[PDB]
Amino acid sequence: TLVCTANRFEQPRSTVLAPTTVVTRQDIDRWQSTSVNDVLRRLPGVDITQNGGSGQLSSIFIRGTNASHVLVLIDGVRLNLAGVSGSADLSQFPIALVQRVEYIRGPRSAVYGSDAIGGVVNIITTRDEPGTEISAGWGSNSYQNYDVSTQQQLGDKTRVTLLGDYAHTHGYDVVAYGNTGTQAQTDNDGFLSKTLYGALEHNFTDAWSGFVRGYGYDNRTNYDAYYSPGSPLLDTRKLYSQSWDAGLRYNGELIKSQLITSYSHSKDYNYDPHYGRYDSSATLDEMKQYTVQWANNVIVGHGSIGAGVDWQKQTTTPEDGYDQRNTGIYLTGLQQVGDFTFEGAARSDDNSQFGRHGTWQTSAGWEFIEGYRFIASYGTSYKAPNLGQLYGFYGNPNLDPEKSKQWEGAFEGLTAGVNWRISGYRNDVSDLIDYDDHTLKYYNEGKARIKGVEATANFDTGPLTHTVSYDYVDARNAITDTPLLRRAKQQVKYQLDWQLYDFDWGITYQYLGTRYDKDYSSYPYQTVKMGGVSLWDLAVAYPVTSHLTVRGKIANLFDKDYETVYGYQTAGREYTLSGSYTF
Numbered sequence: 001t002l003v004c005t006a007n008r009f010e011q012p013r014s015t016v017l018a019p020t021t022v023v024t025r026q027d028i029d030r031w032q033s034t035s036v037n038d039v040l041r042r043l044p045g046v047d048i049t050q051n052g053g054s055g056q057l058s059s060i061f062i063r064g065t066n067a068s069h070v071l072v073l074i075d076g077v078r079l080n081l082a083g084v085s086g087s088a089d090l091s092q093f094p095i096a097l098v099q100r101v102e103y104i105r106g107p108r109s110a111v112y113g114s115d116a117i118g119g120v121v122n123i124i125t126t127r128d129e130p131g132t133e134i135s136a137g138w139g140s141n142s143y144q145n146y147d148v149s150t151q152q153q154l155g156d157k158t159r160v161t162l163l164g165d166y167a168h169t170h171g172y173d174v175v176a177y178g179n180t181g182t183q184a185q186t187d188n189d190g191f192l193s194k195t196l197y198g199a200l201e202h203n204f205t206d207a208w209s210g211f212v213r214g215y216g217y218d219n220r221t222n223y224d225a226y227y228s229p230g231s232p233l234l235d236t237r238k239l240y241s242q243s244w245d246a247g248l249r250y251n252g253e254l255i256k257s258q259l260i261t262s263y264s265h266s267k268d269y270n271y272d273p274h275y276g277r278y279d280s281s282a283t284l285d286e287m288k289q290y291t292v293q294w295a296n297n298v299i300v301g302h303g304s305i306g307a308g309v310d311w312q313k314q315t316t317t318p319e320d321g322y323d324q325r326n327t328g329i330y331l332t333g334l335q336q337v338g339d340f341t342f343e344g345a346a347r348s349d350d351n352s353q354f355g356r357h358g359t360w361q362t363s364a365g366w367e368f369i370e371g372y373r374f375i376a377s378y379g380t381s382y383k384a385p386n387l388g389q390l391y392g393f394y395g396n397p398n399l400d401p402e403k404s405k406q407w408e409g410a411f412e413g414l415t416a417g418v419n420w421r422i423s424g425y426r427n428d429v430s431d432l433i434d435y436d437d438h439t440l441k442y443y444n445e446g447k448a449r450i451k452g453v454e455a456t457a458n459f460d461t462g463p464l465t466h467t468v469s470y471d472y473v474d475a476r477n478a479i480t481d482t483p484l485l486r487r488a489k490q491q492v493k494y495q496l497d498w499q500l501y502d503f504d505w506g507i508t509y510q511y512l513g514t515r516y517d518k519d520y521s522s523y524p525y526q527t528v529k530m531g532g533v534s535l536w537d538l539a540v541a542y543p544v545t546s547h548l549t550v551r552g553k554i555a556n557l558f559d560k561d562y563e564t565v566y567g568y569q570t571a572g573r574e575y576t577l578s579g580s581y582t583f
């Protein structure tokens with residue numbers, strides 16, 4: 001199966017030495033995932049925490065690295081984060097738009113620049129699947145979904161794609177114990193999300209193609225906050241975002257090329273709805289992001305070489321700060337010689353605040369017996385300082401990037417019908433941007449050491465398909481040697497799939513290991529141990545006719561009460577019932 005996230009161009013997965021996962025739309029439909037979080041949580045090396053349930057902030061820790069230490073791409077282009085903190089909030093990205101996820105673990109700054117430390121998550125929005133679908137669902141806590149979608153030819157050489165989605169839930173009380181001020185707020189904390197999307201693809205020739213693509217979503221999230229009597233309670237968020245992409249591609253026999261241009265704008269309010277949103281006490285974060293990427297790649301020898309140039313501008317609304325520019329130039333290559341595979345990338349970034357930083361990576365693999373291979377890898381990567389850190393209340397505008405070195409060694413194989421891989425990796429992160437008590441100022445100074453193991457396998461027993469991973473992550477502050485907070489030390493993930501009669505069943509197990517968080521209810525904030533838990537889901541689909549599929553899910557089958565952030569209640573048992581008429 002193909003990926004194009006490792007070097008921006010289509011290559012076979014067996015050719016990508018770094019561990020790699022691909023989720024298709026078929027997978028997402030079977031899982032009946034109603035968020036990206038639920039898709040992602042299921043994959044190797046991914047640890048998701050949430051401050052609530054649907055629509056509330058979630059963070060991703062890939063292989064023990066900080067939330068901001070993952071690169072999240074939407075069709076190849078950095079996800080627009082308005083915030084001034086460094087981390088994506090995937091709660092907000094509508095699942096309705098996800099047609100494929102390519103997820104590559106290990107460093108990749110040497111291709112994409114900043115953030116690609118633990119790995120890269122590329123969420124792709126383009127499906128090739130003609131016809132038109134209507135779909136819907138209902139479920140627990142007044143969850144309700146509606147969706148219409150069409151892909152149709154507009155004559156020779158042109159495709160229009162349109163989609164509209166409404167999702168809605170009333171949720172449950174997230175509680176937010178310790179974060180709630182003088183009182184608690186017992187309300188249900190719900191989520192409303194509406195998406196619209198349209199694209200056009202065109203073939204000028206068999207080799208040349210162009211595209212124009214735009215989409216937007218308008219999201220409201222209730223949450224719970226610090227209450228102080230007679231004082232505004234900011235406990236509602238309205239996030240608006242839009243993205244527009246145009247591009248041109250050449251797909252020659254040997255030569256491949258792409259020029260992609262992009263514009264994102266997000267507006268992100270937070271407010272007390274009693275006299276609010278447009279009122280002093282309401283907060284507003286806003287960013288516009290422009291991107292221009294040109295890449296080339298040519299087949300040579302037994303493998304390939306490519307190069308690109310990458311440009312990005314981020315402007316934010318109201319010194320000092322407000323406008324940032326980055327330019328990167330990189331090289332990639334790949335070669336197969338006998339039973340050996342060699343792979344590499346190197347990049348030089350030039351950023352308007354820190355200037356120049358270079359990164360590089362290299363992998364070798366050896367197929368020492370047919371179907372069995374050893375792989376060694378090394379790579380450096382980096383994260384740019386955020387606007388809060390640079391220009392905030394505690395700002396230091398002369399910050400340098402956070403730096404990572406990673407090493408990784410893997411055995412993969414095919415044995416008795418079972419495809420399996422096991423990897424050990426070490427990731428030394430340094431120059432971490434820390435607040436410094438004695439100087440009231442951020443500074444590059446912290447260190448972290450992550451030591452991890454990833455084990456995967458998939459096989460079939462009869463009509464049953466098994467897909468299983470185990471993650472070990474020892475993430476620590478390397479100076480003090482204490483565990484980093486909010487990261488599960490071990491996870492076990494298991495999906496069991498089968499078809500009997502025309503019923504398509506899916507069972508999902510996950511163990512979430514021991515994790516540590518701060519209790520915010522009493523100052524000085526104590527670190528506490530969260531115990532760890534098993535969770536099950538059960539999913540059914542049935543093709544009622546050739547046009548109509550109907551589906552049911554029970555998420556968290558045993559009604560298991562747990563938290564991934566101390567004090568924030570998770571879902572409990574939920575039912576979902578949905579349908580799709582295709583035609």
Ligand code: CNC
Binds near residue numbers: 084
């Ligand atoms: C400390 C903190 C927290 N924050 Co702030 C607060 N007040 N926050 C901050 C600070 C983070 C910077 C820092 N690291 O010191 C600070 C002051 C910048 C901040 C800012 C904001 N925060 C905000 C809010 C509303 C919230 N924050 C919490 C996440 C609320 C947290 C409540 C809680 N979780 O207990 C919180 C108390 C602790 C997070 C933590 O300890 N992480 C530990 C770390 C190891 O885990 P982590 O997953 O990597 O956490 C990261 C994120 O929390 C990110 N971040 C923090 N807040 C947000 C909010 C958003 C929307 C996003 C995308 C990211 C963040 O920074 C953290 C570390 O880098 C929140 C859940 C508190 C609550 N229960 O009301 C709430 C989000 C509610 C929701 N589900 O939408 C702001 C919107 C405040 C405002 N109205 O302007 C604002 C938005 C930031 C953005 N980037 O968009």
Ligand SMILES: CCCCCCCCOCCOCCOCCOCCO
Binds near residue numbers: 305335344346362
């Ligand atoms: C053939 C020139 C293009 C190489 C691009 C990647 C450079 C990254 O540095 C790799 C250093 O690795 C040691 C040399 O042997 C393995 C590298 O693999 C080269 C990719 O074909």
Ligand SMILES: CCCCCCCCOCCOCCOCCOCCO
Binds near residue numbers: 346360
């Ligand atoms: C395209 C290939 C890129 C390969 C880069 C690998 C080598 C990079 O050099 C080492 C990294 O650090 C740079 C400085 O090295 C010497 C430092 O010693 C003196 C410091 O006081």
Ligand SMILES: CCCCCCCCOCCOCCOCCOCCO
Binds near residue numbers: 329346347
């Ligand atoms: C065709 C594009 C070439 C891009 C190659 C980028 C090389 C990336 O750097 C690798 C090593 O980075 C660390 C050392 O760099 C510091 C700069 O040194 C120059 C001053 O002595």
Ligand SMILES: CCCCCCCCOCCOCCOCCOCCO
Binds near residue numbers: 369372411412413
């Ligand atoms: C890193 C894990 C160590 C891998 C050890 C495997 C080394 C030998 O590989 C397997 C050799 O194949 C034997 C399996 O049986 C052959 C089946 O042939 C049936 C058709 O006649």
Ligand SMILES: CCCCCCCCOCCOCCOCCOCCO
Binds near residue numbers: 409410423
């Ligand atoms: C080459 C296969 C890699 C998988 C090794 C798993 C078995 C581990 O046994 C050795 C003991 O490991 C010590 C601590 O484990 C975490 C270390 O991870 C590697 C980073 O240095």
Ligand SMILES: CCCCCCCCOCCOCCOCCOCCO
Binds near residue numbers: 420456
């Ligand atoms: C897995 C270790 C032994 C050799 C590889 C077997 C292939 C792995 O596939 C199964 C992976 O799923 C479960 C593995 O659990 C054991 C991993 O423990 C190693 C911890 O250091």
Ligand SMILES: *SCC1=CC(C)(C)N(O)C1(C)C
Binds near residue numbers: 009074075076102126
């Ligand atoms: S996989 C790389 C990729 C994603 C998407 C944005 C759909 N693209 O146009 C490319 C092929 C660059």
Ligand SMILES: [Ca+2]
Binds near residue numbers: 168
């Ligand atoms: Ca309603």
Ligand SMILES: [Ca+2]
Binds near residue numbers: 172175185188
């Ligand atoms: Ca509430």
Ligand SMILES: [Ca+2]
Binds near residue numbers: 188222223235
């Ligand atoms: Ca609330």
